[PDB]
Amino acid sequence: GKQLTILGSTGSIGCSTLDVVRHNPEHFRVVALVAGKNVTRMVEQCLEFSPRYAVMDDEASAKLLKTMLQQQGSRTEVLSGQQAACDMAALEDVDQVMAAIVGAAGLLPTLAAIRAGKTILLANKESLVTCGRLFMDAVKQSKAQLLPVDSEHNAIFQSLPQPIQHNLGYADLEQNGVVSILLTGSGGPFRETPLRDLATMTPDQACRHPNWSMGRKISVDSATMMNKGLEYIEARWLFNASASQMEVLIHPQSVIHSMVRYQDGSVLAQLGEPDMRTPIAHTMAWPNRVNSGVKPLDFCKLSALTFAAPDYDRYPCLKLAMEAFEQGQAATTALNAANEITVAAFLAQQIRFTDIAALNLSVLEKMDMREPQCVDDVLSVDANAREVARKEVMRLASSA
Amino acid sequence: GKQLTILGSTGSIGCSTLDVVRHNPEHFRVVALVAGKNVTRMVEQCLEFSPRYAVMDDEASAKLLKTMLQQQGSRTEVLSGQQAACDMAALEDVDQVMAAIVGAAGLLPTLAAIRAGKTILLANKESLVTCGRLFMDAVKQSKAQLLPVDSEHNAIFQSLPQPIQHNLGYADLEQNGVVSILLTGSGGPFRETPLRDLATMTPDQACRHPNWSMGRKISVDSATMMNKGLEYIEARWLFNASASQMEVLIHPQSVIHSMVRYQDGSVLAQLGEPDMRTPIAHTMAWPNRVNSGVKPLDFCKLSALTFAAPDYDRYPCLKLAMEAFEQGQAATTALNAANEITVAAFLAQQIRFTDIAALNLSVLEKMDMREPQCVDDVLSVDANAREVARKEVMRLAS
Numbered sequence: 001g002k003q004l005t006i007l008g009s010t011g012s013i014g015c016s017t018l019d020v021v022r023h024n025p026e027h028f029r030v031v032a033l034v035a036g037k038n039v040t041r042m043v044e045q046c047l048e049f050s051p052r053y054a055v056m057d058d059e060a061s062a063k064l065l066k067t068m069l070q071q072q073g074s075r076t077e078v079l080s081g082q083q084a085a086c087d088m089a090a091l092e093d094v095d096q097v098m099a100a101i102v103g104a105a106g107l108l109p110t111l112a113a114i115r116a117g118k119t120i121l122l123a124n125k126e127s128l129v130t131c132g133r134l135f136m137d138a139v140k141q142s143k144a145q146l147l148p149v150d151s152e153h154n155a156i157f158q159s160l161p162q163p164i165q166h167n168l169g170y171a172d173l174e175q176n177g178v179v180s181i182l183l184t185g186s187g188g189p190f191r192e193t194p195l196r197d198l199a200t201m202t203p204d205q206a207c208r209h210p211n212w213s214m215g216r217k218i219s220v221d222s223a224t225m226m227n228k229g230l231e232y233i234e235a236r237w238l239f240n241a242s243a244s245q246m247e248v249l250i251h252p253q254s255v256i257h258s259m260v261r262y263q264d265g266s267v268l269a270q271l272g273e274p275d276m277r278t279p280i281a282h283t284m285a286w287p288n289r290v291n292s293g294v295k296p297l298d299f300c301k302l303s304a305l306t307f308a309a310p311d312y313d314r315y316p317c318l319k320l321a322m323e324a325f326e327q328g329q330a331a332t333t334a335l336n337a338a339n340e341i342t343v344a345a346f347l348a349q350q351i352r353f354t355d356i357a358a359l360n361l362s363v364l365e366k367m368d369m370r371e372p373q374c375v376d377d378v379l380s381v382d383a384n385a386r387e388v389a390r391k392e393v394m395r396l397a398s399s400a
Numbered sequence: 401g402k403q404l405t406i407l408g409s410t411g412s413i414g415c416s417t418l419d420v421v422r423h424n425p426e427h428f429r430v431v432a433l434v435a436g437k438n439v440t441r442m443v444e445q446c447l448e449f450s451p452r453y454a455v456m457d458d459e460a461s462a463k464l465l466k467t468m469l470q471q472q473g474s475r476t477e478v479l480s481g482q483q484a485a486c487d488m489a490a491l492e493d494v495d496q497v498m499a500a501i502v503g504a505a506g507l508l509p510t511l512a513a514i515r516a517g518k519t520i521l522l523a524n525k526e527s528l529v530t531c532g533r534l535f536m537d538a539v540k541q542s543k544a545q546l547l548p549v550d551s552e553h554n555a556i557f558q559s560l561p562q563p564i565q566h567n568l569g570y571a572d573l574e575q576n577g578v579v580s581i582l583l584t585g586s587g588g589p590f591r592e593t594p595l596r597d598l599a600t601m602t603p604d605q606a607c608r609h610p611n612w613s614m615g616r617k618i619s620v621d622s623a624t625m626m627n628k629g630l631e632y633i634e635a636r637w638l639f640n641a642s643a644s645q646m647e648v649l650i651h652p653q654s655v656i657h658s659m660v661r662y663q664d665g666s667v668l669a670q671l672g673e674p675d676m677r678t679p680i681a682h683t684m685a686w687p688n689r690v691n692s693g694v695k696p697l698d699f700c701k702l703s704a705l706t707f708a709a710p711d712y713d714r715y716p717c718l719k720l721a722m723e724a725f726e727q728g729q730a731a732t733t734a735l736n737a738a739n740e741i742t743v744a745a746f747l748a749q750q751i752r753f754t755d756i757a758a759l760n761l762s763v764l765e766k767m768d769m770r771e772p773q774c775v776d777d778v779l780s781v782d783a784n785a786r787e788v789a790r791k792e793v794m795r796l797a798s
């Protein structure tokens with residue numbers, strides 16, 4: 001039995017991982033569940049999986065959870081707050097930690113798992129978007145195993161050779177026959193929109209993916225290719241890839257999830273249904289395999305597969321992400337933070353669709369921060385970048 | 401580096417192998433070259449790669465090679481005949497043997513390499529199409545490592561987990577998370593031809609593949625999907641795959657080379673340019689990589705990738721091969737041999753395009769031979785199958 005901690009058990013990734021546990025009771029035992037405020041979901045999960053521990057970040061949520069579990073005869077011990085959440089990530093008997101908390105709040109619990117030398121099933125975006133140097137340095141020091149859960153990074157990982165898989169972050173691509181990492185993205189709803197029409201796209205239009213049904217913020221990041229820009233940042237950290245070892249391709253059908261190019265001409269790819277239980281089950285069972293509940297991909301029921309090079313005039317956020325990487329973790333943290341603000345402003349109809357890239361750039365230009373040296377420095381860059389972005393939004397929404 | 405014997409050095413695969421060595425002179429030493437009758441090409445290869453031995457199967461050819469190397473000042477030792485070729489495959493100091501002799505002549509030298517526990521870069525079709533049971537048994541015994549060179553099988557191998565790659569031929573697919581092997585094929589030039597028109601296709605039409613330029617025999621095998629049927633037979637042996645663990649898919653663009661389906665939903669695939677140096681260089685360098693001279697696949701200059709299920713009314717030879725596998729090595733050997741006869745007859749304008757599958761079936765129906773127990777037994781089945789086929793052709797053309 002692999003013993004697990006699930007950080008962010010009540011969200012989308014957490015629920016999908018619990019479905020894999022559900023399919024494989026003989027392979028995985030839930031030791032600890034951690035969430036924020038979803039008491040109702042958390043009760044159900046505690047009843048089904050009988051974790052030794054459950055933690056809620058919010059103290060009033062933990063209190064309610066403590067009492068309901070007692071009445072429903074649950075023996076799970078209820079804890080509260082961030083220290084408790086990091087402790088679950090570092091439990092002696094825990095083998096793997098599903099790192100699936102959203103936002104900067106995912107940082108310290110994910111780091112706790114890394115410092116404890118655990119296998120980390122990495123979902124939280126902020127980990128490598130904002131703390132990529134700090135976290136890869138930390139995994140190298142503890143020899144923690146990272147296994148990326150994100151569909152694209154997981155596809156890359158599966159398409160990579162065994163010496164890289166087992167030394168992830170540290171191994172040399174070149175020495176292992178790898179010439180580049182091919183990161184694929186859908187191109188969003190506006191792949192073919194006349195460029196001059198982008199300024200007038202509405203929130204509803206940007207969120208109407210042709211081939212996806214997801215939350216508004218991630219849907220906008222798909223439309224700007226900010227989503228791929230952030231995954232570019234993560235992949236360079238995760239896979240130890242230089243700028244010339246990265247290729248971003250638009251692949252509108254999203255059937256190929258990403259690819260790896262080798263020295264002999266070979267390209268290895270992972271394909272599948274768009275269901276997160278595939279990459280989650282891959283990371284949970286690695287180096288073996290487990291049923292995930294995902295139906296086999298039917299090749300006779302596909303759109304024709306196509307590819308194209310991103311136009312940075314169409315996707316300036318993609319180019320900003322790549323440029324941000326070269327400026328360091330202060331810049332990537334600032335871009336991620338500014339983008340949360342400007343995307344929310346766009347969705348609230350305070351700015352135009354094209355003002356996301358323009359204001360993201362303006363924030364980066366106005367920032368003057370030193371390379372972060374610890375998580376606390378990153379949190380400070382993030383706070384400051386948000387304030388700079390909010391003030392840019394207000395300037396635009398008010399004045400000139 | 402690695403010491404190589406190249407069986408069939410003067411042919412297409414042999415020449416591509418030597419091009420990989422040309423790109424990687426520090427990683428590969430050519431110890432022995434073995435060929436048939438192509439003395440001119442053989443001299444040039446001995447002068448470039450400085451092997452210790454050169455073998456011509458044909459004795460007149462060996463005598464002529466010796467005279468030319470002498471004139472040219474080379475001290476490469478010249479040998480002749482079948483035992484010599486097997487001896488090269490078995491040399492104590494060699495690491496890898498490129499098995500690229502064409503036809504049943506490739507069998508004994510390939511077996512010699514297997515019995516010697518060598519790493520076998522396997523590119524002879526008869527080895528597994530005709531001798532799959534005998535050769536996989538021999539591989540388990542000697543612990544020889546097979547590395548398939550054929551593009552589809554190599555793509556599958558690249559897409560399989562490490563415990564299968566090591567242990568190739570005896571590993572359990574299901575235990576290693578593999579649901580099935582997805583063997584991809586172009587569908588040939590008549591993929592969209594009305595079925596009514598197949599009976600009147602000419603040899604020049606059958607050989608005119610929209611995306612290929614190969615020899616006539618294999619171009620016809622692509623048109624009938626016999627080529628994929630034979631690869632289906634090899635894949636079942638190579639990958640220890642039952643019928644239910646095999647899927648054949650038409651992929652017209654031939655960009656994906658083949659795939660492997662996994663328990664969690666994942667499908668891994670290998671893609672690349674249509675250039676045999678890629679899989680050759682993969683097998684030579686494994687488990688590492690080398691430069692092959694092949695240019696990087698440009699994803700911005702591709703046709704859209706499509707897939708389709710093969711229709712056995714359009715491709716009866718594919719179904720015959722799948723069925724032949726279940727009947728055993730006598731049936732697979734008979735089919736391969738009959739198909740050589742019928743394709744040649746088609747190309748000679750003695751029979752129609754659709755007679756190839758019809759007479760292939762007819763031969764198998766006529767034959768009941770028992771499972772071969774040794775290479776002599778398969779040679780015997782092969783010889784009898786050809787005679788049945790030639791008579792079927794003569795009857796038809798009569």
Ligand SMILES: NC(=O)C1=CN([C@@H]2O[C@H](COP(=O)(O)OP(=O)(O)OC[C@H]3O[C@@H](n4cnc5c(N)ncnc54)[C@H](OP(=O)(O)O)[C@@H]3O)[C@@H](O)[C@H]2O)C=CC1
Binds near residue numbers: 057276
């Ligand atoms: N969704 C996807 O397909 C993918 C997402 N990702 C990344 O994975 C992460 C998780 O995504 P997803 O599951 O969709 O996000 P959700 O918003 O669905 O879930 C977030 C989880 O984090 C919990 N949480 C929030 N704040 C805290 C905190 N302070 N302490 C402890 N738990 C907290 C939430 O608890 P509660 O709800 O109870 O308040 C919830 O369980 C994100 O960073 C995302 O970018 C990566 C790859 C794919």
Ligand SMILES: NC(=O)C1=CN([C@@H]2O[C@H](COP(=O)(O)OP(=O)(O)OC[C@H]3O[C@@H](n4cnc5c(N)ncnc54)[C@H](OP(=O)(O)O)[C@@H]3O)[C@@H](O)[C@H]2O)C=CC1
Binds near residue numbers: 439526
């Ligand atoms: N071509 C391809 O893309 C692929 C082919 N295959 C298979 O690989 C094998 C080789 O194919 P290919 O390279 O195309 O074939 P060729 O016909 O081009 O080459 C055959 C080689 O075998 C030699 N040969 C023939 N008879 C003997 C013999 N009795 N003893 C020693 N050598 C002999 C030839 O010598 P010589 O010319 O001097 O007389 C030549 O060097 C075949 O079984 C084929 O089906 C598999 C994967 C890919």
Ligand SMILES: O=P(O)(O)Cc1ccc2ccccc2n1
Binds near residue numbers: 151186209212
């Ligand atoms: O690749 P993107 O645009 O960043 C996000 C995205 C969009 C559509 C998708 C459709 C199926 C699967 C994954 C997808 N991912």
Ligand SMILES: O=P(O)(O)Cc1ccc2ccccc2n1
Binds near residue numbers: 609653
């Ligand atoms: O797949 P098939 O039809 O058996 C043989 C075939 C035909 C065309 C091809 C084009 C590019 C690469 C491989 C090919 N192979």
